[PDB]
Symmetry: C3
Subunit: 543 residues, 3 copies
């Protein structure tokens, strides 16, 4: 045989998993993975060197589901796949988010992941297999990537966690959580829940981190048999040759103008070395201020939420509307009601999917006082909308009790720290303003964690600037009864279960404070739907 095939078989919970390299796509770092009824081809290409003036890490992940994987011919676009669907973009982000922090600081080589679903029996989602396939392909690619990573979906059926459930099991699950981590740390959580408790949600994360260990060890042994060797790449050294005042200006526009003016002063006095070192000085300054117990940039302590303003019915002709402001973060959110003709229809490997609820998220450049080019929905816009949708999903009325198509739009009018959680609150408010009966109102809060050794602080309702210096960022949305969505991104070692427990408990108080302010304005759906909404009558006559 002309191929030198390396195979690794192992049992991953209820599914057999096979890792193969050496036969397909030998000119990249390519793993063909089969997990149950799903087969994915993941090719990784690592540029041998960094580009001349590259100052950031260029990583792109492109995930695709071929229609031929399930014996389908693509529909009505010249019979071609076309651009990435929203579901494909979302899975791309699931792969990108855990791997991106695992490359060392100062590693600027281009990396491209191409993950292609080439066979599916339509019984389960292919994202976990694509995530394991990416992990394995990076493990043999010869980069300083600090893997391997594992991945797992955790459901909750009959009060018990379930590892990597299929579509049929998920129809009885109160939880849809995906977690990725390394051998020692959780990295990424993306989840939707039916008002579960903080304790239930954390347990699902630790259950998933524990169960994925068998897969990480199998990737490790596979990479060894494929001849992978430790990286010798060494990070270049830096030119080893008062700050607080600017970071006490509370207004975001004026603080940056003072900081940007400080940077011009530094460049005149002292090019890429000044750019890198100047940002690190700002990085070090704001973090030690938090850890030393000083007031934050805007004067808050670690547990205080920013000032809130809650308004509904702000648009005369929208079926429901709300303006939600949290400090300098603001969302104009509307609810529109429609008939069957308006439902969202999308193609999947399992067949055509009709969805009576959709949430669209727009983040224009004027929300941060900037100019920007005009384009279609961005990967981040798609992700933030989907997370806010997860925060609202569990409290939506059942279709047979409220037979309308529902479209929510969140227009971010101001941004300074999770507009996506502002979107959850505004969606809850605008739904009730339209007369959509909710199970309960829901709110969201974005949190941060700064850690140095054994010293750590959890930050409630983080600023735009605290998002860029945190070692852990996490977002919780929920009702008074429990969590409806939990998202996490962890960049560091040593965040224990006990630490995450404190962080979620602090977030619970913040979400309850926001919910309490919301209820002063509207706490239930209006008794009638909007006067402008199309009526649903037993007899309709068309002239």
């Amino acid at each position: 045989s002309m191929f030198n095939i390396v195979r690794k078989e192992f049992q991953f919970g209820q599914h057999q998993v096979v890792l193969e390299t050496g036969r397909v796509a030998r000119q990249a770092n390519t793993v063909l993975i089969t997990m149950g009824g799903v087969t994915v081809l993941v090719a990784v290409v690592a540029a041998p060197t960094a580009k001349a003036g590259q100052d950031f890490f260029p990583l792109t992940v492109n995930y695709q589901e071929k229609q031929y994987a399930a014996g389908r011919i693509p529909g009505g676009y010249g019979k071609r796949e076309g651009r990435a669907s929203e579901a494909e973009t979302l899975i791309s982000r699931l792969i990108d988010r855990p791997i991106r922090p695992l490359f060392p600081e100062g590693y600027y080589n281009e990396i491209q992941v191409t993950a292609t679903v080439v066979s599916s029996d339509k019984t389960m989602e292919a994202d976990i297999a694509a995530m394991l396939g990416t992990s394995a392909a990076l493990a043999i690619a010869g980069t300083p990537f600090r893997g391997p990573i594992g991945a797992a979906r955790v459901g909750l059926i009959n009060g018990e966690y379930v590892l990597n459930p299929n579509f049929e099991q998920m129809a009885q699950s109160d939880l849809d959580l995906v977690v990725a981590g390394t051998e020692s740390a959780v990295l990424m959580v993306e989840s939707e829940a039916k008002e579960l408790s903080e304790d239930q949600m954390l347990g699902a994360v630790l259950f998933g981190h524990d169960e994925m260990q068998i897969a990480i060890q199998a990737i490790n042994e596979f990479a060894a048999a494929a001849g992978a060797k430790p990286s010798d790449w060494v990070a270049p050294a830096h030119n080893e040759e008062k700050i607080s005042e600017a970071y006490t200006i509370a207004v975001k526009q004026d603080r940056y103008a003072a900081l940007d003016a400080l940077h011009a002063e530094a460049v005149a006095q002292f090019a890429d070395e000044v750019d890198y070192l100047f940002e690190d000085l700002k990085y070090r300054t704001v973090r030690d201020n938090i850890l030393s117990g000083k007031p934050r940039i805007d004067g808050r302590d670690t547990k205080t939420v920013r000032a809130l303003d809650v308004q509904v019915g702000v648009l005369e002709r929208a079926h429901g509307s709300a303006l939600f402001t949290r400090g300098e973060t603001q969302a104009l959110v509307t609810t529109t009601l429609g008939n069957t003709r308006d439902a969202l229809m999308v193609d999947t490997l399992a067949g055509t999917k009709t969805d009576n609820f959709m949430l669209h998220y727009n983040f224009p450049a004027y929300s941060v006082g900037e100019t920007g080019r005009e384009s279609g929905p961005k990967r981040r816009e798609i992700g933030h909308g989907r997370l806010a949708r997860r925060g609202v999903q569990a409290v939506l009325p059942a279709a047979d009790r409220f037979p309308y198509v529902i479209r929510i739009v969140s227009d971010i009018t101001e941004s300074n720290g999770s507009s996506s959680m502002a979107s959850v609150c505004g969606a809850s408010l605008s739904l009730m303003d339209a007369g959509v009966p909710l199970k309960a109102p829901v709110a969201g809060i974005a949190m941060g964690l700064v850690k140095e050794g054994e010293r750590f602080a959890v930050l409630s309702d983080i600023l735009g600037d605290e998002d860029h210096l945190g070692d852990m960022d996490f977002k919780v949305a929920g009702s008074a009864n429990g969590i409806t969505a939990l998202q996490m991104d962890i960049k560091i070692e040593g965040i224990t279960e006990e630490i995450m427990e404190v962080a979620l408990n602090q977030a619970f108080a913040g979400r309850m404070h926001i919910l309490n302010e919301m209820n002063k304005v509207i706490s239930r759906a209006r008794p009638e739907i909007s006067m402008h909404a199309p009526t649903f009558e037993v007899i309709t006559i068309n002239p």
Copy 2:
């Protein structure tokens, strides 16, 4: 309250108008305007400085109508808004055109206008409100913008001008004119008319300029209460340390080659300062030649139209075709006839719109002897086609008398001065060639005005070069009975009613001269439609 809200209420003709800032989108310069049943959010972002090597004024206006504004769910595109519709692009141009000349020469800061319709009761167009909203947002943005501007739509009902008519009033109007100006000058006119006279058309412009004054003064008082202050920006000075001969070469290709070669000679002898000063020398040279009564670049006096060639039936299988040449401006224009299946269907806030007439305008780079990248319809292409459509609309047969879908395409094959008016003539010719019975033939002419103090000259049928040096550019299309479309763009002060009256009278002679040449070839529709056109029969049998 966490907001410092500034409100200005005033009555604008038949509509109440409210101007608000300080609550929504505080990180931009943002005005929320309500005018009757329409609400628009206009955010303006002004870059604090000009970019390093910026040599032109970067201004972009993006106008959008949200479907939720009228309780609608967008149709069949993942239920998203998607890219700007043609109607949205056209309103963007309505905002851009009057504001763009009001920034001083040498002001190169980036400016971006984002105007979003967030509520509409579907009774009237939202463009005027979006234009007033842009005016107000710029007034508080701290730029050297020389506003405020006003805007107004003028109709003609029962021989009387009507200010800002709604959809129901416009169904009885013989005029659809939009004008913008400042306190002292008209800036922009865009109009469609049912063969009205020069006197009627000018009166509508002055009526609109007069009625908008109340709105300009209200914007002025609103901006003062919002704390706007005069700009201190000062234009940088220039390096203050024979031309006619090149501008007597009549052939455009050879004239530019001589001029471009002169620029290389100047650069070798004397970088951005030479580029700027070299163009200003060409600018000063051609204008004084006109004002001093010398023959124009091609030898013409101020009132002479270029040589004309008129040909119909130039394509064997097009239902109608025409080749119209005016000097070095040429349009290959076709008419195609179709059945109901071919009608243009578009979504509006008022509902789905079926249009039995469409005109598409293509401007390839080879028309000016250039290379260019391949793309979709440009903003200028969309505008020029819509203006030529306005010039043809009034003479089209009523659908119940001529039950065909009509598509006109204007392919610009040569350009040297309004291809859009060439398109009007070619559309008129090709319509008759196809057998489309017109009320009367129509023609167009593009005019220019150069003014210095009290000295001024009106230019008939302007060259490409005279378009770039004129202080007023204006286009008139019409029949022998009257004007069907009037477009104006004025960059200067002091163009009186009496002056515009002379300019339109000169344009009337030019359009009549062009029409007279057209009638020598074909003056009425052919008695039959094209032999290749689909027949319209009482009994059709499908095998």
Copy 3:
């Protein structure tokens, strides 16, 4: 008349041809050609100089069929033409391929061809007329283009070659071949055939080269009457002030890394002059090695095919699947079966076209170990898929005997020398794996020819590197009975009939060797279609 019209009429086989310039689009180099019922407007723009740092020849050809040409209104896209269809892109490549090598080495001026079909009576394809129109427009454009070229389609009806057949004649043709050449040499062949012999295929090429001579001479006389004059452009001279070892490394990745490292060594020791001269040294080295009878880069002699691996059923849920590997060229090819709803539907000038077979070709950057941006189907991807489709077409079952829609996808997983012929083999294999009864299996091979004076060598199964140094590249696909597709691209003078005869005979042995290896794995369609394919039953019941 304001026009100086130059006309050239001649009879081209069965069609009258008219060449006209001087009336339409005078600001470019523009020819309006009528050939039978087809009229095309071809504008050529040649930049007067090369750009500052231009190091390659920027040539773009854009071909368009206007719907108005045949009295049609475009369908359901705002009634606009939109982007180039696949059929339009393919004809663009037909024009580009023969003209691109006819510009001298070192000519870097930008050239843009805009060919627009403006009238068609729907009796025949407009590509030949567009090709002749491009030839004529370049002939008057004043460039060093070494034309004119001719073009012709050759069919085979009742054992006889037919010049430029129309749609009705092509329905009885066993051949669809398009050839372009100059007065002395064939340049380009693109063809589909019903298993014809090498002798029949070569005769069609020489028939077409002979018959087009009358058209070339007419273009020559037309260009003279239009005042064309010889080019005085002279190619700039070069700075006139051991290699084998790197080109004996057989592994492609390691060979390039050694070569790229050699280039960095040369740049350190000796900027554009080093880049140009360094590539020419590699060019000269590899060609003389072949001509002197030394083993090729990977050790092969001129007639040896690379090692082969043939696998079917490699995807569990694809209706048919195959992995075909030839050295370092690999294709993952699938067959999917569908019902009538899945058929490809496209608009043509002749009407709506329903196609029950389609082949899609994807060439991701990881196939050559590279990163690349994400985009839609490229012009080269469209061409390679269409050629592989031509190689499979003749052996597909008739629709009334096999009533399924068939979609083939070729995913190139490795590339080092015609993935398009790998796609033919993989399509043949995957079709049989799905149970599609073929007339016979088909295979493909890509060939090269290096010639110096009277010394020449024909290369079987060329490497990526031999494709970049060949003077003739040609691809043959076929069954054991005969050729199903033949593609050629010739850059040089003096490739005689006798030489092409030897080259095709060598290619026949190579294709038979590949076919023989394929038949060891599967030589007939499986007796049943895939268990996962939708069944075709006389009675279907829908719940």
